[PDB]
Design a protein around this ligand. Structure first.
Ligand SMILES: [K+]
Ligand SMILES: [K+]
Ligand SMILES: [K+]
Ligand SMILES: [K+]
Ligand SMILES: [K+]
Ligand SMILES: [K+]
Ligand SMILES: [Mg+2]
Ligand SMILES: [Mg+2]
Ligand SMILES: [Mg+2]
Ligand SMILES: [Mg+2]
Ligand SMILES: [Mg+2]
Ligand SMILES: [Mg+2]
Ligand SMILES: [Mg+2]
Ligand SMILES: [Mg+2]
Ligand SMILES: [Mg+2]
Ligand SMILES: [Mg+2]
Ligand SMILES: [Mg+2]
Ligand SMILES: [Mg+2]
Ligand SMILES: [Mg+2]
Lengths: 140, 70, 100, 184, 62, 141, 140, 71, 81
RNA sequence: AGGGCACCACC
RNA sequence: ACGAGACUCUGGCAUGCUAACUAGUUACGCGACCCCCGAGCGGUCGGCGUCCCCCAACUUCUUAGAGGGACAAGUGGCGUUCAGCCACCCGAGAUUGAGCAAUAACAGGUCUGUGAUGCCCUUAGAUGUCCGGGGCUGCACGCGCGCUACACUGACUGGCUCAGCGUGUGCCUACCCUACGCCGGCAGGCGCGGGUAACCCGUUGAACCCCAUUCGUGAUGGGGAUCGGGGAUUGCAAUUAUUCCCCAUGAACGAGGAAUUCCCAGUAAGUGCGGGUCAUAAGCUUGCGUUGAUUAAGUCCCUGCCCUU
C-alpha cells in the first residue's frame, strides 16, 4: 500500500490529491481531468502531464478533492496539488534521482507548480471602498 | 530601509565586548548565544541583534573597530 | 461509567489553557481515559463605531472586538470523581459547564 | 515535447528582426507556454514584465475599459479567436504576425515637453506603447460596430505587421515621430 | 541620415522637469568609439539598445 | 462502464431531456406556456419544451447531491436580479416550478422522498441516468 | 427559405398602428401600446405562431388570429394576472386595453382623480411627481 | 447615415452569397453582413446553410465568434 | 443569600491611578490650591515607587478663561502595546 | 538663495 | 528621556509537536447503479456503518495551542569602505496590512450622548410631560457624496460550476435564523421540524465568470425614469405612493466643457455576500471573499509641508 496525500493552494482554494499505486487514473471530484470547468484553462490542468509525459503517471492513480476559492483559483490549486503529489510519491517510493529530474522540469516550466503563491486579499480600510482607494474628496 | 536603531547597535556592541570568545561568523550560533547570555524580550529583536553581532564580528576579524573595545 | 463532557469558555487564552492542562493532569493522575482538549473555532465579536461623539471631523472608526475561546474535554469516570477533579482551583474568567 | 500556444501555434520559427527589442519580446524557448494565463507576479519588480510572455501581455492589455476589468478568460478567448482569424487571413504564424506588429508599432523617438524636446525611447517603453496602441486601435474599431472584437484585433495586428497606414497603431506612431522630429 | 543603433553603457541619471527622462551614455554598435550622451523616455538599463533616428545630437543636460 | 460524472454535463442534460420527452409519461402543468421561471427573469423561456430540460437538470442535480427540497432547487436555479437604477441582487427561482418538476419526476418513479426530508433518486432513476450517460459517451466516441 | 417571399409585407397596419415587417413577430407586435414583450410572447404561444418568422412572413389568417387573441385574451386561457386592466374601477371587468383604448383609459383615470380632487389628481394637474418622490433636486 | 440591412435575401443577394462567399479566406457573420449588407441573423443562417450544403468549412464555433473558411 | 460582598485594601495605594485621582479630587474639593495638591499627589506617587507620573488638571482654574496645568515627573511612555 | 519630502503633489 | 523604532493584532510557511463523533481523511464491510467485454484488487456515490454492549487506523486536508522560521543572514558590486544601497542564490516569505502614537496648540466640533456641568431662561394658559393630527419629504433654481447607464469585450433565454467574513429565539422587549412537505404564476400562505449554534439553516449550490441560444448597429430585445391598473406582507395606522410582486407605459442618455478625485499588487477596477440601521428596510456605511490588470521604482515642474543661510 503506497500512497501520499499532498495539497495545493491558491487564494482560499485548496485541493488535496491522493496519489496511490495505480494504472494511470486522474480524477478531480470524481470527474475526468478533461471535464473540469472552465475549459478555457484546460491546458493549465494538463501542464503537469504534458511536461512529464504519461509514462510517469502510468504507475499511479490520483484523485483530487478541491474546495474553496473560485474557478480559476481551484484550477491552479488542482495543478499544483497534482505536481506536488507526483513529486512526493516519487521521493517516497522511487529513487531521489527521478524526483529531482521531474522537480527540475516542473520548476523550470513554472515555479507555482510546486511553490504556492502567498498573495491574499488585503483588508478594506474605512474611508474608502477598498484596501487602497479612498472616497472622492470635495473642497467647495 | 534596513538601518538598525541604537537599541540594536548598542546591545550588539555590549554583547561583543562582553562575550567575544563565544561569538563567531555564524548567525545561527550567534543567535543561540545571544538568547543564552541576554534577556531580549522579543524574537525579532533577538534576530536583529544577532545579525548585527555577526556583521560586527566579520568587521572585527577584518580589522579594528572604533565602537568596540575588546 | 457515564460519559462526562466539560466545556470551558474564556476570553483569556493563557488562563483557559492553564485550566485545561490542570484538568487533564488531574484526570491522568486519577488514571482516567480522557480525550484531549478539542479546540472549537474562536469567536470574534466585533463592534465598529464612529470615534466622535458628535458628527464632526474626519470619519474615523473604532474597531472593538472580543474573542471567545472554547474547549471540550471528554472523560469516562463516575460523576463524583468528575466533580472532585473539577473542584480544583479555577482561574477567574473561565466558565465551566459539565454535562453527563 | 514541443509547446504550442493553444496547442496550435509553435514558437520555434518565430523571428524577432529588431535586435533592440529581442530582449523585451518574450516569445520562445523558456517563454513558450500553452496559454496566455500564468497568474505570475511580473509587476513585483522593475523590468520583470520583460519576462512576461508577449501574448499574455497583449491579453492583459485587452482588459479595458472598466466594464471589462478582470475578465482575463474573456480576453484569452478573444486572443485565441484573433489568432485563428489571423492564420486564416495570412497563412502565417500568428505569433510572427504579433511580433511584427509590435516591432512596427513601437515608436523610436518621442518628445518630452520640458516647448518640447526630442528624446529617444527605451525598448521596454517601445514594447509597452506598441501593445497599448494595438489594443486601443482594436477596441475603438470594435466599439459600436457589428464587427467583433476578435476580428478587429486580427485586422489591427495584420495591418500593423504589414506596416500599413490603415493601422491605428501605425498612424499614432507616425504622428508621434513626426512631432518628435519637429521638436528636434 | 541612416538609422543608427547604440548600446547603453552607463545610466547617468534622471532629468526633465518631472524627472521623466533618463540621461545615459551610449556606445555605437557600428563603431565601438563615438560614445555620446542621450536622453531617453521610459525605463532603461545598462545593455539596452536604442534606435537613434538622428545620431548627431547630444543631450546637453536637457 | 459509464457514469454521469464521466460525461459532459450539458450534453447529458440535453440527452436526458430528449429521453424524458420521448417517453412522454412526464406530467406537464397547464401553465408552462405562460409563466417565467423566476421573478428575476424578464421573459419566459425561449425553448417551448423547457419543462423537460428543467426536469432533466433537476434529476441530474439529485443524482449528484441527494436530499434536496424545493428550497434547495430554488437556490440552485436562482440568479442575478437587476433592479433598474438600483444595484443587482441574488434572487431565487420559482417554487411552483421546482415543486411541479419534483412531483412529475416522482410520478415517473425516478424520484422518491428522502427519509431526512427532500427528494432523492430511486435505483430505477439512477439506472436510467447511467444508461443515458453511457449513450452520451458512445455518441462522443 | 432565406429568400424573401413575394407576399412579404414591409409594413402592416394592426389596430391603427404601423408594425414593421422586418422585425421578428414577437418584438414587432410590441409596437402596439398595451402590448409588451411578455404579453406578445404569450399571445403568440396561444396563437400557435412560430416565433422565428418575421412579421411580414405571417399570412392574413395568422395575423387575424393573432389580433383576435390579442383583443380577447380571456377566451384563450390568458390568466387575469397577465392583464394590464384588471378589475376595472367602473365595470369590474378584466381586459387588456390596447392603443387608443389605453390612452382613453389613462385620460379617464386622470379625469376621475381630478374630478374628486384627490391628492394624486391634484399632483397630476399641477404637473408634479405623484408617487412621493423628492422634488427638491431631481426632475428639473 | 444609418445602414439598412436586409432581413431576408433577394435573388441578387442570394446569388452573390452562393457565388462569392465560398471563396473567401475568412468567413464570419460580421464580414458577410458588411459585404452583403445583410443582418447578423441572416448572415448566421446563410452560413449555416452553406456549411450544411458543404460549400464552406467550419474552423471554430463559439457563442461569441464563429469562424468559417473555404474548402 | 447567593451574593456576598467583601472589602479589601489596595496593596500599593500610591500606584493606583483611580485612588490618586480621587485623592486629588477631594483635595481640590477641600479648597486646596491646584499646584499644591497636584505636586503633593505627584510626590506621593513617585515616593510610592512609580517610574513616572503625569497629572493634568483642566478647566477654569483661574478666571473665566479655561486652561490646563500639566505636572510630569520621571519616565512616561505613550505609544505601543 | 540653496536643500529635502508626499499618488490627501506631480510624472 | 519622549516621539520613530521596538511593541500588539493580522497574512503567508511547518506531511515536525499536541489531538479531536460539534472536523475530517484513508482503509475496510454492506448497499445502489454502469460495463460480459476487456465483469475487475474496475468505476461513481455529500448512500449507510466501523472508540459510542463489541465492532479502524490516522491527522495531509479543518480547527487552535506551543514552539520554530528572516537576520540585509550568504555571494557579487558600489560606498569614506563606515552607516548603508543595488543585484542574485537558497528560501513560504528578502518592504503584508492595521492598531497604538510626543511637546505645543485651535476660542476647530459636540452643553441635541449622558443622573457630565457653571450661569441665564422657563416652570401649571409650561420651553415639563402625554395624546391626536400635520411637518422634518414641500419645488422656477445652485452645489456636494453616490447608484444606473449610454451597449455586441453586450442584452436575453437556458445549461454548467466555485467563496469568505459573519448573524441567528432578546431583563425591560413586543421583534430570531430557517430546513422539509403542501397550496399559489409571483410576491406570498398553511403545516410540520432543527438550532441559544464547528451540532440547525449550511457542503452557506453567491454574482461576475464559463458553455450554448436569440437579437444585429436601429434610442434597438441598449436604458429603465415617469406613469395606469391589480395582488400581497409589516404595522394600531401605509394617502404625500413603507416595502414586495404582476401586466402595461418606455423619458434623458450615443462616453460628457472649464475643472477635478482616488490609486502601484492580489492593488485599481468589475462582481456579488454579510454586519449596522431594521416592526417594515439599503442607491449609505463598515467588513468579506471572487475575477484581476495597465503604468512606475522617478522628480521638485504644479500643490503643499519641512530645513539652512
Ligand atoms: K463589436
Ligand atoms: K457633550
Ligand atoms: K448647559
Ligand atoms: K445638557
Ligand atoms: K442630533
Ligand atoms: K446617543
Ligand atoms: Mg475591491
Ligand atoms: Mg444561479
Ligand atoms: Mg407595446
Ligand atoms: Mg518608546
Ligand atoms: Mg510605533
Ligand atoms: Mg489634489
Ligand atoms: Mg496626472
Ligand atoms: Mg495539520
Ligand atoms: Mg468655536
Ligand atoms: Mg432632512
Ligand atoms: Mg433591457
Ligand atoms: Mg427602446
Ligand atoms: Mg446614514
Amino acid at each position: 500500500l503506497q500512497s501520499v496525500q499532498v495539497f495545493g493552494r491558491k487564494k482560499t482554494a485548496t485541493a488535496v490529491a491522493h496519489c496511490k499505486r495505480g494504472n494511470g487514473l486522474i480524477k478531480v471530484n470524481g470527474r475526468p481531468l478533461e471535464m473540469i470547468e472552465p475549459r478555457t484553462l484546460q491546458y493549465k490542468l494538463l501542464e503537469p502531464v504534458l511536461l512529464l509525459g504519461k509514462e510517469r503517471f502510468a504507475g499511479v492513480d490520483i484523485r483530487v478533492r478541491v474546495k474553496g476559492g473560485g474557478h480559476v483559483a481551484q484550477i491552479y490549486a488542482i495543478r499544483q496539488s497534482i505536481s506536488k503529489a507526483l513529486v512526493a510519491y516519487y521521493q517516497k517510493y522511487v529513487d531521489e534521482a527521478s524526483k529531482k529530474e521531474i522537480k527540475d522540469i516542473l520548476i523550470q516550466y513554472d515555479r507555482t507548480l510546486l511553490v504556492a503563491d502567498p498573495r491574499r486579499c488585503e483588508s478594506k480600510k474605512f474611508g474608502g471602498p477598498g484596501a487602497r482607494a479612498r472616497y472622492q474628496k470635495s473642497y467647495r | 530601509g534596513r538601518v538598525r536603531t541604537k537599541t540594536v547597535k548598542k546591545a550588539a556592541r555590549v554583547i561583543i565586548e562582553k562575550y567575544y570568545t563565544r561569538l563567531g561568523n555564524d548567525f545561527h550560533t550567534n543567535k543561540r548565544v545571544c538568547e543564552e547570555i541576554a534577556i531580549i524580550p522579543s524574537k525579532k529583536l533577538r534576530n536583529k541583534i544577532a545579525g548585527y553581532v555577526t556583521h560586527l564580528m566579520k568587521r572585527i576579524q577584518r580589522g579594528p573597530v572604533r565602537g568596540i573595545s575588546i | 461509567i457515564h460519559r462526562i463532557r466539560i466545556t470551558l469558555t474564556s476570553r483569556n487564552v493563557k488562563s483557559l489553557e492553564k485550566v485545561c492542562a490542570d484538568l487533564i493532569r488531574g484526570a491522568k493522575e486519577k488514571n482516567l481515559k480522557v480525550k484531549g482538549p478539542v479546540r472549537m473555532p474562536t469567536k470574534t465579536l466585533r463592534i465598529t463605531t464612529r470615534k466622535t461623539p458628535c458628527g464632526e471631523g474626519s470619519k474615523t472608526w473604532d474597531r472593538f472586538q472580543m474573542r471567545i475561546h472554547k474547549r471540550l474535554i471528554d472523560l469516562h469516570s463516575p460523576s463524583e470523581i468528575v466533580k472532585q477533579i473539577t473542584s480544583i482551583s479555577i482561574e477567574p474568567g473561565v466558565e465551566v459547564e459539565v454535562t453527563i | 515535447p514541443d509547446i504550442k500556444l493553444f496547442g496550435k501555434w509553435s514558437t520555434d520559427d518565430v523571428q524577432i528582426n529588431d535586435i533592440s527589442l529581442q530582449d523585451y519580446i518574450a516569445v520562445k524557448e523558456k517563454y513558450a507556454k500553452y496559454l496566455p494565463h500564468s497568474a505570475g507576479r511580473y509587476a513585483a519588480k522593475r523590468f520583470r514584465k520583460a519576462q512576461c510572455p508577449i501574448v499574455e501581455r497583449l491579453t492583459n492589455s485587452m482588459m479595458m475599459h472598466g466594464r471589462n476589468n478582470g475578465k482575463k478568460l474573456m480576453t484569452v478567448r478573444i486572443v485565441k479567436h484573433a489568432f485563428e482569424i489571423i492564420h486564416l487571413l495570412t497563412g502565417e504564424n500568428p505569433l510572427q504576425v504579433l511580433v511584427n506588429a509590435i516591432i512596427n508599432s513601437g515608436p523610436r523617438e518621442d518628445s518630452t515637453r520640458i516647448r518640447r524636446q526630442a528624446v529617444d525611447v527605451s525598448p521596454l517603453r517601445r514594447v509597452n506603447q506598441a501593445i497599448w496602441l494595438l489594443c486601443t486601435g482594436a477596441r475603438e474599431a470594435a466599439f459600436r460596430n457589428i464587427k467583433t472584437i476578435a476580428e478587429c484585433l486580427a485586422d489591427e495586428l495584420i495591418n500593423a505587421a504589414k506596416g500599413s497606414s490603415n493601422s491605428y497603431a501605425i498612424k499614432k506612431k507616425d504622428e508621434l515621430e513626426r512631432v518628435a522630429k519637429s521638436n528636434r | 541620415q541612416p538609422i543608427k543603433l547604440a548600446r547603453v553603457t552607463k545610466v547617468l541619471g534622471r532629468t526633465g522637469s518631472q524627472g521623466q527622462c533618463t540621461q545615459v551614455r551610449v556606445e555605437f554598435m557600428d563603431d565601438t568609439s563615438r560614445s555620446i550622451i542621450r536622453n531617453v523616455k521610459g525605463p532603461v538599463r545598462e545593455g539596452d539598445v536604442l534606435t537613434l533616428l538622428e545620431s548627431e545630437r547630444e543631450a546637453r543636460r536637457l | 462502464g459509464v457514469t454521469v460524472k464521466d460525461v459532459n454535463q450539458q450534453e447529458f442534460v440535453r440527452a436526458l431531456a430528449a429521453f424524458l420527452k420521448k417517453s412522454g409519461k412526464l406530467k406537464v402543468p397547464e401553465w408552462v406556456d405562460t409563466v417565467k421561471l423566476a421573478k428575476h427573469k424578464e421573459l419566459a423561456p425561449y425553448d417551448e419544451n423547457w419543462f423537460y430540460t428543467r426536469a432533466a437538470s433537476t434529476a441530474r442535480h439529485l443524482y449528484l447531491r441527494g436530499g434536496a427540497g424545493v428550497g434547495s432547487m430554488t437556490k440552485i436555479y436562482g440568479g442575478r436580479q437587476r433592479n433598474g437604477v438600483m444595484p443587482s441582487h441574488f434572487s431565487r427561482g420559482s417554487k411552483s416550478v421546482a415543486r411541479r418538476v419534483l412531483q412529475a419526476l416522482e410520478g415517473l418513479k425516478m424520484v422518491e422522498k428522502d427519509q431526512d426530508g427532500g427528494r432523492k433518486l430511486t435505483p430505477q432513476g439512477q439506472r436510467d441516468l447511467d444508461r443515458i450517460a453511457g449513450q452520451v459517451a458512445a455518441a462522443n466516441k | 427559405s432565406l429568400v424573401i417571399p413575394e407576399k412579404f409585407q414591409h409594413i402592416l397596419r394592426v389596430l391603427n398602428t404601423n408594425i414593421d415587417g422586418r422585425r421578428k413577430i414577437a418584438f414587432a407586435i410590441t409596437a402596439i401600446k398595451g402590448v409588451g414583450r411578455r404579453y406578445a410572447h404569450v399571445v403568440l404561444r396561444k396563437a400557435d405562431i412560430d416565433l422565428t418568422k418575421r412579421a411580414g412572413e405571417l399570412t392574413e389568417d395568422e395575423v387575424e388570429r393573432v389580433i383576435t387573441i390579442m383583443q380577447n385574451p380571456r377566451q384563450y386561457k390568458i390568466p387575469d394576472w397577465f392583464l394590464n386592466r384588471q378589475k376595472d374601477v367602473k365595470d369590474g371587468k378584466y381586459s387588456q386595453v390596447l392603443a387608443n383604448g389605453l390612452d382613453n383609459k389613462l385620460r379617464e383615470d386622470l379625469e376621475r382623480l381630478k374630478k374628486i380632487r384627490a391628492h394624486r389628481g391634484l399632483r397630476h394637474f399641477w404637473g408634479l411627481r405623484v408617487r412621493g418622490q423628492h422634488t427638491k433636486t431631481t426632475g428639473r | 447615415d444609418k445602414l439598412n440591412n436586409l432581413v431576408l435575401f433577394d435573388k441578387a443577394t442570394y446569388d452573390k452569397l452562393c457565388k462569392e462567399v465560398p471563396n473567401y479566406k475568412l468567413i464570419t457573420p460580421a464580414v458577410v453582413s458588411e459585404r452583403l449588407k445583410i443582418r447578423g441573423s441572416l448572415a448566421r443562417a446563410a452560413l449555416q446553410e452553406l456549411l450544411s450544403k458543404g460549400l464552406i468549412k467550419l474552423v471554430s464555433k463559439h457563442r461569441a465568434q464563429v469562424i468559417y473558411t473555404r474548402n | 443569600g447567593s451574593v456576598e460582598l467583601y472589602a479589601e485594601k489596595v496593596a500599593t495605594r500610591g500606584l493606583c491611578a483611580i485612588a490618586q485621582a480621587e485623592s486629588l479630587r477631594y483635595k481640590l474639593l477641600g479648597g486646596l490650591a491646584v499646584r499644591r495638591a497636584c505636586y503633593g499627589v505627584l510626590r506621593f506617587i513617585m515616593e510610592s515607587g512609580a517610574k513616572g507620573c503625569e497629572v493634568v488638571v483642566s478647566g477654569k482654574l483661574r478666571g473665566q478663561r479655561a486652561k490646563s496645568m500639566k505636572f510630569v515627573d520621571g519616565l512616561m511612555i505613550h505609544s505601543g502595546d
